[PDB]
């Protein structure tokens, strides 16, 4: 983004307060996702205009756990004024993306008329007023479209009317548009008999090789609103690596509670396994990555790492992950991150001793599986802790020495 975008993000995140620090850390990430969506509308807001958003996000009614309540949020964001502070946002764009269908057309009619009034009456003396007004509407809609392809979704260009969408038609369209609030809106318009099916369709359509970060909040909403998670697994297994794609994108956005629910349902309740050895290793290393990027959520990331790593269904995967061969071992992008998390000094953690216990157990497991390769394992781990930089790593500090001290502790 821009430098100003990082500043307004930090300002909005500072407003989030909560006693439960796990809840506060999750809500700050929700604000980050909100900013990444609506940065084009708030990029130039000073503190006088930002106060409106401060009071909106301070409202507990705008929240549902660690996630924003789009029904309450879309209401407050379309109000002209809340408690002596005027809404500084362009309200047409807010009503469009939040599907406030009672206000979309009136707000657009205001912008259409004030924009139409700035053209000279004799500007285009070949066009009729019918053609003149349609040209003004198309120019205005094309102008707002620069902020996103979803901002002409509700205004018919021939009539200027509020467009009407079937529940299924609008649901499929908002999934393709990667439009989180529109997907949830049209979901609640669906017949009950179709709710589970449409959510599953969105999940398998978005769990694809080239998914992006924007897809994760949609995948999170769909999974959270699916009752029969066992049936969802069977439909996801109809597509190659569909299970890996869903979990991977959720992990990168720190939807830990959703991933834990899926891991518990599909792995903890023959020889057929639902994902491969590589999927297994990429789950753990990606969790270790976001663990360092989000220290306030390191407890949840560590729990997820241990659930997946120690799952009895993947005991063979676990042994292979600590097999040192060709001067490398798959667990180095997990054990190294855990050592860095345990040693970081920019935070005040209560349970550093539990972190050390997990690290020593992981090392003892690697030593027990392949005793004749343990010397190379230690050599490989020390080398990786010295060459590969990481977030949360103390600069100029030899982390290979930390590995040497842990190996010496285990005799």
């Amino acid at each position: 983004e821009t430098k100003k975008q990082a500043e307004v993000l930090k300002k909005l995140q500072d407003v989030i307060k909560h006693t439960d620090r796990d809840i506060a850390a999750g809500r700050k990430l929700a604000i980050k996702r909100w900013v990444e969506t609506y940065i084009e509308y708030i990029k130039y807001f000073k503190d006088d205009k930002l106060e409106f958003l401060y009071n909106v996000f301070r409202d507990e009614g705008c929240w549902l756990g660690t996630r924003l309540n789009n029904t309450v949020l879309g209401q407050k964001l379309t109000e002209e004024k809340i408690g002596e502070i005027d809404n500084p946002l362009r309200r047409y764009g807010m009503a469009s993306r939040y599907c406030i269908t009672g206000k979309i057309h009136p707000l657009f009619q205001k912008r259409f008329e004030s924009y139409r009034n700035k053209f000279p009456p004799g500007a285009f003396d070949g066009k009729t007023e019918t053609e003149f007004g349609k040209y003004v509407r198309n120019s205005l809609l094309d102008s707002i479209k620069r902020k996103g392809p979803v901002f002409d979704f509700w205004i018919d260009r021939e009539s200027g009317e509020l467009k009407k969408y079937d529940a299924v038609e609008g649901f499929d369209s908002t999934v393709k548009l990667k439009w989180s609030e529109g997907v949830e809106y049209f979901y609640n318009q669906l017949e009950e008999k179709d709710k589970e099916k449409k959510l599953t369709e969105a999940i398998v359509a978005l769990s694809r090789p080239q998914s992006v970060k924007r897809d994760a909040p949609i995948l999170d909403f769909c999974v959270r609103n699916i009752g029969d998670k066992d049936t969802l697994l069977q439909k996801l297994l109809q597509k190659d690596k569909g299970v890996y794609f869903l979990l991977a994108e959720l992990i990168e956005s720190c939807f830990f509670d959703t991933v834990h629910d899926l891991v518990q349902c599909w792995c903890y309740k023959c020889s057929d396994k639902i994902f491969s050895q590589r999927d297994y290793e990429l789950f753990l290393s990606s969790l270790s990555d976001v663990m360092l990027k989000n220290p306030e959520l390191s407890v949840q990331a560590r729990s997820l790492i241990m659930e997946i790593w120690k799952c009895e269904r993947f005991a063979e995967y676990r042994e292979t992950s600590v097999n040192t061969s060709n001067y490398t071992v798959p667990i180095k992008s997990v054990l190294g991150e855990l050592i860095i998390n345990w040693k970081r000094e920019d935070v005040c953690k209560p349970d550093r001793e539990i972190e050390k216990e997990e690290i020593l157990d992981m090392i003892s497991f690697a030593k027990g599986c392949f005793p004749e390769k343990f010397d190379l394992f230690k050599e490989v781990m020390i080398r990786n802790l010295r060459l590969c930089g990481r977030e949360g790593k103390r600069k100029g500090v030899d982390y290979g020495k930390f590995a040497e001290e842990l190996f010496l502790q285990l005799e």
């Binding site: 130039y44 924009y115 700035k118 205005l140 102008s143 080398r383 060459l387 590969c388 600069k395 030899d398």
Partner: protein, 740 residues
């Protein structure tokens, strides 16, 4: 690919096989030859290839390799220590009598390029460390030269075998430096140095001043490292870079750190670091379709590359920033910013439809944490110039974004030096005009309101004054005067805005002044509120500059025609002819005001026009399509390299059911008078024929088998709009791609 491998051919003495394999690698790194003379870029590149060949299963263990950096040292003509060198490599295999020696430098006449007598003895000494039973009588030295220098030529030479002492040279480069330092006289010639006597201690030191180092395979095989990077999963690519690959590259660099860092001053860490990384990638160039995009311009140290077998369409781009002084975590921030804007900087996004990238900060000099890795999404290149000009009035950092927008879209092939000042000025002003004059969108105010913009351009009374002046009047809102002037074009005065119909009572007049300084940076002064419109017009009645304000005509019809041109009508000549008829119609009123004074000005105006319009999705200026290679007891193989560039390349975005990007290419020329017109059409049509000889360059950019090419000549002396831009009248514009 289908080659044998660069090192494999070289070691076997297959000079022809090495040549074809190397020009295939040059097709993969189109900017490689721009830097072959920058420091030790070329020696380190070849050293990296030799030092990782065993680990890549290219050479066998019994094929022992020895090397040394023969640094050029002090220049006898200015006394300054040079940072260039010759790389000298020898391969020896027990049981084989032939010992092949290679001398690698940018020029075949580079100082001390030949193997010296003391270098032969030091090499034999190294060979004997592993083979104690060596018989030198059974050794047959085959000596080679590998050089490439700027057009650009690359030469592979089998040196003639010389008899007796002439078999090896008297001094290497470093020996001459050693003796010039010993005698404290850097201007001494080799003949003068020969005359000087040396005691026993000095000769002993001189003999150990040259010494070879054996390249030893490590404990890690790298055969499948490119397989790890030929992936469409960003987490997989990031994990493989964070672990095996970047650990191997930095650790291998560390293993030879003493040979790289010692006996040289003023070492160019930037170019050597990029050469080292490129040598690692080049050891896979014969087996993978690797695209490497190198930006080693001043103030830039970027390498972006893409790894695939051949046809993959969504593999992950890898964007690296090589720092030499800043820590790699800062270099990662620069690489992340470069990757976010990859559509602006690189041709890599043309070869992959991935929306995810992996970014890397790397600094070989650090012992701890020489690299850091992250992933970032790829953003669209859609900067609204006029909209940001109004926004920068009250907001910080927007001036930097406006400056970056103009500078980053300059053609990379134009160096930013005082010799090319007018070239850069023509490009900035022409691009800024095309963007602003052809942007059809109204101004979006911060408050919930929209206003149309009437655009003007000011024709200064002095036709020699190098200054682009434009005025943007949003209805009911403020007025912005934009200046982009040269360093010697400073003025004292105001632009008369009486022709404008200002109906609002709050309309202000702003001034945004840009200057291209003598260092070819673009300074944008803080915007100045010149007061209310009627207040501004009251004042300056005795301070109005001489000139005329011309209104930019409407250009909405160009966007609609561009939509039809890039899509359904991309092979219809009549559709292209109509597009330039409308561009001619919009430009003719102001042709002498915008002043299309050069081919750069004409090209940049069309670049800004095509950028602002929704179609085409992507437009590239001076896009390199590829290059051509001409071939011209001693065997000298000399190859001349000729580049084929497209003045303008227009591309669609690949859709799911429409993989054809409809590549449109325009060859642009400028004619100042009628006599030049026929000669400019002939040169433009001849350049078209040169482009029709290139097929492999167009294949990766489209899924179809056709490329549309049109010669375009700007007629500066045209009297009517119908002849301003000359389009071919009445086949010959569809280049059929032969994928056979």
């Amino acid at each position: 690919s289908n080659g044998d491998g660069l090192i494999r051919s070289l070691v076997d003495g297959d000079l022809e096989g090495f040549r074809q394999g190397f020009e295939s690698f040059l097709d993969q790194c189109p900017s490689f030859l721009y830097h072959v003379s920058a420091g030790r870029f070329l020696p380190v590149f070849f050293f990296s290839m030799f030092s990782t060949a065993h680990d890549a299963n290219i050479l066998n263990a019994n094929e022992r390799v020895y090397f040394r950096f023969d640094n050029h040292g002090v220049n006898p003509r200015n006394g300054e220590n040079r940072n260039t060198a010759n790389l000298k490599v020898a391969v020896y295999r027990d049981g084989q009598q032939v010992v092949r020696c290679y001398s690698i430098s940018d020029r075949p006449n580079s100082d001390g390029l030949r193997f010296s007598t003391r270098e032969r003895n030091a090499l034999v000494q190294e060979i004997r460390r592993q083979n104690p039973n060596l018989r030198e009588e059974d050794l047959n030295f085959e000596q080679y030269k590998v050089c490439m220098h700027g057009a650009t030529v690359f030469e592979v030479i089998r040196e003639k075998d010389r008899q007796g002492r002439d078999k090896f040279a008297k001094y290497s480069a470093s020996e001459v430096h050693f003796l010039r330092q010993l005698f404290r006289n850097h201007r001494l010639t080799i003949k003068e140095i020969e005359g000087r006597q040396l005691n026993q201690n000095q000769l002993r030191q001189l003999g150990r001043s040259v010494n070879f180092t054996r390249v030893e395979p490590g404990q890690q095989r790298i055969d499948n490292f490119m397989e790890m990077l030929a992936s469409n999963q960003r987490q997989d690519v990031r994990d493989s870079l964070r672990g095996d690959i970047l650990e191997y590259v930095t650790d291998t660099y560390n293993n030879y750190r003493a040979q790289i860092e010692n006996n040289i001053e003023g070492r160019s860490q930037k170019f050597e670091s990029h050469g080292f990384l490129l040598g690692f990638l080049a050891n896979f160039s014969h087996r993978y379709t690797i695209g490497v995009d190198l930006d080693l311009s001043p103030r830039n140290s970027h390498v972006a590359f893409l790894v695939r077998h051949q046809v993959e369409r969504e593999n992950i781009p890898i964007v690296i920033n090589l720092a030499t002084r800043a820590p790699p975590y800062i270099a990662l921030n620069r690489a992340r910013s470069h990757a976010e804007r990859l559509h602006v900087f690189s041709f890599i996004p043309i070869h992959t439809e991935s929306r995810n990238t992996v970014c890397v900060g790397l600094n070989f000099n650090l012992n701890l944490d020489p690299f850091s890795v992250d992933t970032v999404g790829l953003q669209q290149d859609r900067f609204p110039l006029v909209q940001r000009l109004f926004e920068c009035l009250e907001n910080e950092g927007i001036r930097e974004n406006i400056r970056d927008f103009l500078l980053h879209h300059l053609p990379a092939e134009i160096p930013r030096n005082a010799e090319n000042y007018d070239r850069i000025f023509d490009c900035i002003t022409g691009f800024a005009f095309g963007n602003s004059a052809f942007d059809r969108h109204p101004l979006e105010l911060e408050e919930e309101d929209e206003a149309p913009i009437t655009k003007y351009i000011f024709r200064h009374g002095d036709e020699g004054l190098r200054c682009l002046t434009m005025v943007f009047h949003a209805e009911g809102s403020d007025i912005v005067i934009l200046h982009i002037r040269a360093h010697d074009a400073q003025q004292q005065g105001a632009i008369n805005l009486q022709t404008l119909n200002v109906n609002g009572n709050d309309v202000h007049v702003w001034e945004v002044s840009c200057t291209l300084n003598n260092q070819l940076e673009l300074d944008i002064d803080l915007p100045n509120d010149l007061g209310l419109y009627h207040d501004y017009q009251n004042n300056n009645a005795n301070n109005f500059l001489a000139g005329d304000l011309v209104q930019v005509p409407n250009t909405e019809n160009v966007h609609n025609t561009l939509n039809q041109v890039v899509n359904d009508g991309w092979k219809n000549i009549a559709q292209h002819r109509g597009l330039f008829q409308e561009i001619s119609g919009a430009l003719m009123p102001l042709v002498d005001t915008i002043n299309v004074n050069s081919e750069d000005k004409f090209r940049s105006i069309l670049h800004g026009t095509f950028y602002a319009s929704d179609n085409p999705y992507k437009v590239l200026a001076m896009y390199k399509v590829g290059q051509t290679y001409s071939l011209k007891g001693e065997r000298v193989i000399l190859t001349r390299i000729t580049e084929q560039r497209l003045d303008l390349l227009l591309l669609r975005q690949p859709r799911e059911n429409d993989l054809d990007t409809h590549p449109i290419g325009y060859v642009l020329r400028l004619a100042n008078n009628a006599e030049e017109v026929g000669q400019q059409q002939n040169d433009a049509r001849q350049e078209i024929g040169r482009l029709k000889k290139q097929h492999r360059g167009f294949i990766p950019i489209t899924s179809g088998n056709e490329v549309v090419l049109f010669p375009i000549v700007f007629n500066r002396d045209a009297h009517e709009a119908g002849n301003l831009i000359l389009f071919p009248e009445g086949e010959e514009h569809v280049h059929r791609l032969d994928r056979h």
